[PDB]
RNA sequence: CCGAGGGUAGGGCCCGUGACUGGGGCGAAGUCGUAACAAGGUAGCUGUACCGGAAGGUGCGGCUGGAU
RNA sequence: UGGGAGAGGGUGGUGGAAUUCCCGGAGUAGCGGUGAAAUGCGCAGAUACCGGGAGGAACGCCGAUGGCGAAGGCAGCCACCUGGUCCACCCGUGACGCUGAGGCGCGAAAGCGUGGGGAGCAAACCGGAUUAGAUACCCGGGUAGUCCACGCCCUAAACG
RNA sequence: CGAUGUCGGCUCGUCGCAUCCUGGGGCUGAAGAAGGUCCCAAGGGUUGGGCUGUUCGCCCAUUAAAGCGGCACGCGAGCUG
RNA sequence: GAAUGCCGGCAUGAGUAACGAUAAAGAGGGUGAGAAUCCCUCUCGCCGUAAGCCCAAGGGUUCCUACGCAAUGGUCGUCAGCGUAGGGUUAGGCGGGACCUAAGGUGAAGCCGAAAGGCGUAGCCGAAGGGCAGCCGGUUAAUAUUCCGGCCCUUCCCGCAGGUGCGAUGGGGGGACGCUCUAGGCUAGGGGGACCGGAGCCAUGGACGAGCCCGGCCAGAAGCGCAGGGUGGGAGGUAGGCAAAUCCGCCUCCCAACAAGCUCUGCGUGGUGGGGAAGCCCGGGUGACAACCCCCCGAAGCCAGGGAGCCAAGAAAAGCCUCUAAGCACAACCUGCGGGAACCCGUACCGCAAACCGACACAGGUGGGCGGGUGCAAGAGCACUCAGGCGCGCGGGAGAACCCUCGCCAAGGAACUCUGCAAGUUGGCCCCGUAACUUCGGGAGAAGGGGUGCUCCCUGGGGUGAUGAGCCCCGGGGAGCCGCAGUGAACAGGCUCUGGCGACUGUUUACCAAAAACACAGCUCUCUGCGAACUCGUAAGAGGAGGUAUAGGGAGCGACGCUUGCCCGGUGCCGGAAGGUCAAGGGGAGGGGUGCAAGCCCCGAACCGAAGCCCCGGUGAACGGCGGCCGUAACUAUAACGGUCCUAAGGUAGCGAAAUUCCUUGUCGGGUAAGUUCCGACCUGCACGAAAAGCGUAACGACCGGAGCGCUGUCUCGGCGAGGGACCCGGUGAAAUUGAACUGGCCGUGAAGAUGCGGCCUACCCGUGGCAGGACGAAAAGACCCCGUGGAGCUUUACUGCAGCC
RNA sequence: GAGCUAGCCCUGGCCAGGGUGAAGCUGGGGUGAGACCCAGUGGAGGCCCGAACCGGUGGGGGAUGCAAACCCCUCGGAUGA
């Protein structure tokens, strides 16, 4: 059946990406956040 | 007058359609028209703020000359009346001398070919406009502005109409077709005759899928709701309503007026509306 | 091949009968009231409509086959 | 062919009296209603009076023992559209007539449907009387309806 | 109560005897035939159907008889539901 | 040493279940240390509206080749989507960007908000919509509309020539639109050919044939032909299209007008370029100098922005054309031609799946296009089959119980059971025929019955030709033939009578309920005069609505028919300029503290002072309510009638043992041999009743009752048979559970149901296939129940606040 | 967090084949004119049968599954809400 996962390029880079974090007070506090945990992606990987 | 079907499916037993005989015309004028952009009754924020609205068909908006002293002693022919999707009465298309082309709503009685003006000075005629002070009284008028130049507010809906009752300074006073009585501006622009269409009231939608075409969505009672929902949700199997009937919101809806007291328009309004 | 008729299926008409039910006729020695016949104590009758334990009442219109 | 009378019918308009309601003024101790009363209304200002407005229905006098229509039935006034009918002339046609099972149309009021309108009135209904009782008669309220458009209903002491 | 699954049916039995039938008896208001009542007796047997979820019960047609109880109101790591 | 403790390791169950669709395999040859499993050949089977082909997502080297097999692969492995390495993706024309706008997002101006931030006409961003120039073939191990070959095309720059008042982000036209139905003419695709090309074949009784088998095209500028789309021409007037305008709009006149003309597209032809089968031979060669033609069927595609009908009335913007403004008119633009210039990103491969989403090489999910042939009435249905792709990554035997899925059955035929649950029956097409009732549509495929193949002969109309043959579609009549049987296989309703409920088609508890629930046309109450009421938001702003009382919000009821009574004392809502109560504030009689004083400070009576409440009235399709007792009639019985208590008033019409009736299987009637159900009645309705509507109602229903006919393995009552398992052998190899165990019966006892205690009985040691009575067997710290001054959802005339409103 | 799911908004796409045969139109009949009747034409519908597609009715299987909702048979809708 039709399960929760559904990939699409463009939806994962316009919600989860490096330009709406940024957009956004608690965006913001999610690099920051993920920068002082030392993450090695702040935002996820998507190919575009 | 409304036509009726044969009843070859359960539907059209009971489905009645306007006729459409005043329509000579089947296509708007092309630079008259816009994209009428669709709510599904959500706001700015997109919340839905009136309920079961939205899936109608699509609309293009029609936009109506709802001001006509804008164009004072300018003669007008009535080219075409015309179906308009975004209101009940149906529309007349006007060819001004001017060359200039617009869109009034179309007067129970108007005929294609006829020439109409609007203007202190125009004939008491069916399809021109006045200001009101200039109307005769006891002449049945539509299309009114409230206050002057602000734009028709009043009488727009197929068949209503207000009539001029008296004058006082510089107020006329208007039967509207609520029953209310009111004052109203003299100089305040009104059109002779009353709105066209009025059959439209004896439409009989006939099926679900009717409203559904117009828009309208399914309203869901109440009383068919749990009390997260509603005052009236809850209960085990059917149950009265328990309580004073209240609206979603918990105001009641019977007989509770809800005009707001101290608004300063009551100083204009003569008589509650009746019936 | 046709064919008495038998068989399957579906219709039509008529008769008898049926828990129960509608009113009708008659009986008369009862209970309730007294609607009509006199101006019958609200003149009567009437088509219709609504109502009332009952006769009946009232509305609308009609008739005189109504007393004074 | 030339004339007449007429509430004959249909459509659009339009006038005044009166009732009720709303507003303004003036005024106060009751008004109303009946056989007599009570319910009702009234000092939260009624009734009676004056001015203004709204609205519906019906048309006083003329009006009669009258007129018109096939019957039902038709009554302010104006116009339009339209039917029947009578008279004089004795001009045209030449028995072209009478009746009429069926058919078709019309058909008071009440009633029905869809929409409108709603002043007065008023089934049902509520209340006051009357009365032995009074699901009535009389009184105070009052919804359909009564009015308009279209469609049904097709009855009558539709009688001379 | 850190769980002992419940009515009824189906399936499969097994046991008790306060015995429904069949076998053996005494008494009888036992002539015979048919019964009644008590005693001994558990070896075997103890039908099919209509109604109702029913157990039970009532009814139809039979029968030698159409017994009554226990087994966690026997039996859901056997089925149904 | 215990915490259903934590982390790790390792056991038991156990060589057990299983090895993931029952589409299926066999053999020969090869390779290799090793082969059911890799390669090759023959045979067999399966898909073929796919299980084949193409594209978009998503995935990200999985692609190709060489070398490998530790692990991954449910077995094996020499193989592989696996390991190592090397190689592979080529564009002005395909897609996206250097173009356009949609919702939406963002946002100069502006508005709002303690901060963060929220909005916001223009503008900008935003596509799978608009717009825009490439077709066919060849080539690689692997890319190709990209390379190559042939034939075409677009834009930009410059130049030449000719032409013109040139010029835009501004004006206008256009772009530009729905649903259903559909004409003409074409193309895609397909069928046939006694015709054209072709390697070859004659078998096994016959055939050297009008035999068999194979193939018989594709692209193509200008020109031309056929079929369509789009478009009226001239002058005069002009005040409108937010400047200007010669454009467009409007008026008038003339001609032309279903013609033409101009213009654009499709199709055909078209110089030219390609392709080219079976078979044979070792992907390639040959076939071949291949042939490349005729007839027919024919789209849902094309002409297209076609036509008609209908109501629910069907994007924008740019490209494009036209108009003019600044400007500039040696410029500029337009047309033709010539040369030059033409960037960035994607391109491999999987793609209904072993490469995507499901932890797995997972029977699940995944949008668009192509999807051949024959027959069955049609079709994308069904059976077979083409091209193409597969046999599903454990096998070999055996031939028990039992399970699954399947086939048949004597006699009976629902006797099964809660229920015909399940399974039979019925089954397509043509013809005949068809009831109550009905809203006149329907009910209806009612029901029920007849026909159905093949052969010969005769013939009717339609399409294509030409008006004929030929082809093709729909027929009709006659006469015959065969079988148990002719929709001979596959796909394809069992029917009827009668109740309840809901009018109807729809919708719902994703994953235990599809219903009588929700919705629904329709009915009624009520609010709302527009900066509407109402809703979201602190606000600005929005929705409502670019709507205006024939409209918008809220509520109930729920097609339609006939109806919808009585009670307004309580609560609600509505109306009420009186009166009572009424807070802040106003007022300040009077009184107090302090100071020597003026003075400063405090308390405070009458009186004035809103909404609200009290009070008066209205209001039921507003919340709601709608009695009791005694007596009375020629026999009993009952009570039309009278009396009396109470009430705000005492349930009307209709219905009633009901989706409601306790007593109850009420009673009577019907149906059955028999009927707690069902249907029809009665009425002492425990406890119907009129918009939480009452009573009916044709049609409808995977709803829930009752009955009958048909037919059956449901059953009496079971038997046999098939395949996939179970079983045995080879390969791989789990799980929950588990204090430890050397773990029998009875009768007792024991915390009251004992393998484990007592007495007695029975019992050699160990497995294998089976069955489930016990181990109070496993699972889940009982959901019931109670308890905790535990929690949370919900309600209200509980308390206390708050928003909101007055 | 709306890549599942619910609703709406914008823009695209899809629905084999067969059946029934409304209005309208035309012709004829009818009448004073009509209503209306009949035939042909026509092609309507939350119309009918049935694939794709969307569902999930009854049963059976599955139940340490192929699957944390699947499989077989059957069944509802299939121009529309
Ligand atoms: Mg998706
Ligand atoms: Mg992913
Ligand atoms: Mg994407
Ligand atoms: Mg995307
Ligand atoms: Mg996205
Ligand atoms: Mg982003
Ligand atoms: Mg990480
Ligand atoms: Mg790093
Ligand atoms: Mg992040
Ligand atoms: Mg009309
Ligand atoms: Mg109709
Ligand atoms: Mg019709
Ligand atoms: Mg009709
Ligand atoms: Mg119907
Ligand atoms: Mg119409
Ligand atoms: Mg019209
Ligand atoms: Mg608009
Ligand atoms: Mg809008
Ligand atoms: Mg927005
Ligand atoms: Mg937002
Ligand atoms: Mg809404
Ligand atoms: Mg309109
Ligand atoms: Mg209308
Ligand atoms: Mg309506
Ligand atoms: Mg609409
Ligand atoms: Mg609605
Ligand atoms: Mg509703
Ligand atoms: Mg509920
Ligand atoms: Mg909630
Ligand atoms: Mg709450
Ligand atoms: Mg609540
Ligand atoms: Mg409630
Ligand atoms: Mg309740
Ligand atoms: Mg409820
Ligand atoms: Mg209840
Ligand atoms: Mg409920
Ligand atoms: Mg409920
Ligand atoms: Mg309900
Ligand atoms: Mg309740
Ligand atoms: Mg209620
Ligand atoms: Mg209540
Ligand atoms: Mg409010
Ligand atoms: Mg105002
Ligand atoms: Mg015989
Ligand atoms: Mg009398
Ligand atoms: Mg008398
Ligand atoms: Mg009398
Ligand atoms: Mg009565
Ligand atoms: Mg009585
Ligand atoms: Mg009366
Ligand atoms: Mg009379
Ligand atoms: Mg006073
Ligand atoms: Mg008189
Ligand atoms: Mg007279
Ligand atoms: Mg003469
Ligand atoms: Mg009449
Ligand atoms: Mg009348
Ligand atoms: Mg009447
Ligand atoms: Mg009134
Ligand atoms: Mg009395
Ligand atoms: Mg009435
Ligand atoms: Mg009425
Ligand atoms: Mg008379
Ligand atoms: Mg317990
Ligand atoms: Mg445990
Ligand atoms: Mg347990
Ligand atoms: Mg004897
Ligand atoms: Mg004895
Ligand atoms: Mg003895
Ligand atoms: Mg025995
Ligand atoms: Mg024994
Ligand atoms: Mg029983
Ligand atoms: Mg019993
Ligand atoms: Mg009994
Ligand atoms: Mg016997
Ligand atoms: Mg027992
Ligand atoms: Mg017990
Ligand atoms: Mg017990
Ligand atoms: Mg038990
Ligand atoms: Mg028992
Ligand atoms: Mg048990
Ligand atoms: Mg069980
Ligand atoms: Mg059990
Ligand atoms: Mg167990
Ligand atoms: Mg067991
Ligand atoms: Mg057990
Ligand atoms: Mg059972
Ligand atoms: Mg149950
Ligand atoms: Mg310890
Ligand atoms: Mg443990
Ligand atoms: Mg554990
Ligand atoms: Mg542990
Ligand atoms: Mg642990
Ligand atoms: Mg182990
Ligand atoms: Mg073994
Ligand atoms: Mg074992
Ligand atoms: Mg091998
Ligand atoms: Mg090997
Ligand atoms: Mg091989
Ligand atoms: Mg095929
Ligand atoms: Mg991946
Ligand atoms: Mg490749
Ligand atoms: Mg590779
Ligand atoms: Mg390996
Ligand atoms: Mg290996
Ligand atoms: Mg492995
Ligand atoms: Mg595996
Ligand atoms: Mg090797
Ligand atoms: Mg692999
Ligand atoms: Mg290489
Ligand atoms: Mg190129
Ligand atoms: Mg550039
Ligand atoms: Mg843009
Ligand atoms: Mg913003
Ligand atoms: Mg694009
Ligand atoms: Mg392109
Ligand atoms: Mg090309
Ligand atoms: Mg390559
Ligand atoms: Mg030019
Ligand atoms: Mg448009
Ligand atoms: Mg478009
Ligand atoms: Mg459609
Ligand atoms: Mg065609
Ligand atoms: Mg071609
Ligand atoms: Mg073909
Ligand atoms: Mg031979
Ligand atoms: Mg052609
Ligand atoms: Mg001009
Ligand atoms: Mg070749
Ligand atoms: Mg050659
Ligand atoms: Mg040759
Ligand atoms: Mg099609
Ligand atoms: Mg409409
Ligand atoms: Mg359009
Ligand atoms: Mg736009
Ligand atoms: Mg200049
Ligand atoms: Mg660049
Ligand atoms: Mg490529
Ligand atoms: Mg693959
Ligand atoms: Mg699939
Ligand atoms: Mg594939
Ligand atoms: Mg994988
Ligand atoms: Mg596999
Ligand atoms: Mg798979
Ligand atoms: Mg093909
Ligand atoms: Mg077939
Ligand atoms: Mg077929
Ligand atoms: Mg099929
Ligand atoms: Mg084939
Ligand atoms: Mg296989
Ligand atoms: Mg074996
Ligand atoms: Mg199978
Ligand atoms: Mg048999
Ligand atoms: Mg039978
Ligand atoms: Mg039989
Ligand atoms: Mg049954
Ligand atoms: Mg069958
Ligand atoms: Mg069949
Ligand atoms: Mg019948
Ligand atoms: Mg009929
Ligand atoms: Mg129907
Ligand atoms: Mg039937
Ligand atoms: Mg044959
Ligand atoms: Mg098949
Ligand atoms: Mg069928
Ligand atoms: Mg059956
Ligand atoms: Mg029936
Ligand atoms: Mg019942
Ligand atoms: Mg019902
Ligand atoms: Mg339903
Ligand atoms: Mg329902
Ligand atoms: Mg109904
Ligand atoms: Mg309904
Ligand atoms: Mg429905
Ligand atoms: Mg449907
Ligand atoms: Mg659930
Ligand atoms: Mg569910
Ligand atoms: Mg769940
Ligand atoms: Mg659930
Ligand atoms: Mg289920
Ligand atoms: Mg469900
Ligand atoms: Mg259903
Ligand atoms: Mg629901
Ligand atoms: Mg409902
Ligand atoms: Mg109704
Ligand atoms: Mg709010
Ligand atoms: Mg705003
Ligand atoms: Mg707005
Ligand atoms: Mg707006
Ligand atoms: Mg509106
Ligand atoms: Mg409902
Ligand atoms: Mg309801
Ligand atoms: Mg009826
Ligand atoms: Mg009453
Ligand atoms: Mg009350
Ligand atoms: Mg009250
Ligand atoms: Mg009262
Ligand atoms: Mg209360
Ligand atoms: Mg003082
Ligand atoms: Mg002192
Ligand atoms: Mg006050
Ligand atoms: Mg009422
Ligand atoms: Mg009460
Ligand atoms: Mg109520
Ligand atoms: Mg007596
Ligand atoms: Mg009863
Ligand atoms: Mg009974
Ligand atoms: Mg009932
Ligand atoms: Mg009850
Ligand atoms: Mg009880
Ligand atoms: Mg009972
Ligand atoms: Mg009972
Ligand atoms: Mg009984
Ligand atoms: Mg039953
Ligand atoms: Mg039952
Ligand atoms: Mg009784
Ligand atoms: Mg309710
Ligand atoms: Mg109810
Ligand atoms: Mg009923
Ligand atoms: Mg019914
Ligand atoms: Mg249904
Ligand atoms: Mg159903
Ligand atoms: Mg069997
Ligand atoms: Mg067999
Ligand atoms: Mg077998
Ligand atoms: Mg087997
Ligand atoms: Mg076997
Ligand atoms: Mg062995
Ligand atoms: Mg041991
Ligand atoms: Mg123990
Ligand atoms: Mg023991
Ligand atoms: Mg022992
Ligand atoms: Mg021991
Ligand atoms: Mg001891
Ligand atoms: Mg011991
Ligand atoms: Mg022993
Ligand atoms: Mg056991
Ligand atoms: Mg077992
Ligand atoms: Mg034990
Ligand atoms: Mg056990
Ligand atoms: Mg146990
Ligand atoms: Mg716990
Ligand atoms: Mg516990
Ligand atoms: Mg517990
Ligand atoms: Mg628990
Ligand atoms: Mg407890
Ligand atoms: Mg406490
Ligand atoms: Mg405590
Ligand atoms: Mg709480
Ligand atoms: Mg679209
Ligand atoms: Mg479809
Ligand atoms: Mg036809
Ligand atoms: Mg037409
Ligand atoms: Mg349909
Ligand atoms: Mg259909
Ligand atoms: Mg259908
Ligand atoms: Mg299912
Ligand atoms: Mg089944
Ligand atoms: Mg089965
Ligand atoms: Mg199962
Ligand atoms: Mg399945
Ligand atoms: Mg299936
Ligand atoms: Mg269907
Ligand atoms: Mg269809
Ligand atoms: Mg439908």
Not at chain 2, 34 to 43: F, H, I, Q, V, Y
Not at chain 2, 184 to 208: F, M, P, R, S, W
Not at chain 2, 256 to 275: D, H, V, W
Request: charged share 30%.
């Amino acid at each position: 059946m039709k399960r929760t996962w559904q990939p699409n390029r463009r939806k994962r880079a316009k919600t989860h990406g490096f330009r709406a974090r940024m957009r956004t007070p608690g965006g913001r506090k999610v690099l920051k956040r993920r920068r002082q945990k030392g993450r090695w992606r702040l935002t996820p990987a998507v190919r575009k | 007058a409304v036509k009726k079907f044969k009843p070859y499916t359960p539907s059209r037993r009971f489905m009645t359609v306007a006729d459409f005989s005043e329509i000579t015309k089947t296509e708007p004028e092309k630079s008259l028209v816009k994209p009428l952009k669709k709510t599904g009754g959500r706001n700015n924020q997109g919340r839905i703020t009136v309920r079961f609205r939205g899936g109608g068909h699509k609309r293009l908006y029609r936009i109506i000359d709802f001001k006509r002293w804008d164009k004072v002693g300018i003669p007008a022919k009535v080219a075409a009346i015309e179906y308009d999707p975004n209101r009940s009465a149906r529309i007349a298309l006007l060819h001004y001398v001017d060359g200039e082309k617009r869109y009034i709503i179309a007067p129970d009685g108007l005929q294609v070919g006829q020439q109409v003006v609007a203007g202190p000075d125009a004939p008491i005629q069916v399809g021109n406009a006045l200001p009101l002070r200039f109307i005769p009284v006891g002449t049945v008028v539509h299309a009114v502005e409230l206050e002057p130049k602000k734009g028709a507010k009043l009488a727009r809906a197929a068949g209503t109409s207000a009539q001029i009752q008296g004058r006082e300074g510089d107020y006329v006073i208007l039967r509207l077709p609520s029953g209310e009585l009111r004052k109203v501006h003299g100089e305040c622009y009104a059109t002779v005759g009353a709105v066209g269409n009025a059959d439209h009231k004896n439409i009989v939608l006939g099926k679900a899928g009717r409203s559904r075409w117009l828009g309208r969505r399914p309203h869901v009672r109440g009383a068919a709701m749990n009390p997260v929902d509603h005052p009236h949700g809850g209960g085990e199997g059917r149950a009265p309503r328990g309580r004073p009937p209240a609206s979603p919101w918990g105001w009641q809806t019977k007989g509770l007026k809800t005009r707001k007291r101290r608004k300063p328009s009551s100083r204009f309004i003569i008589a509650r509306r009746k019936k």
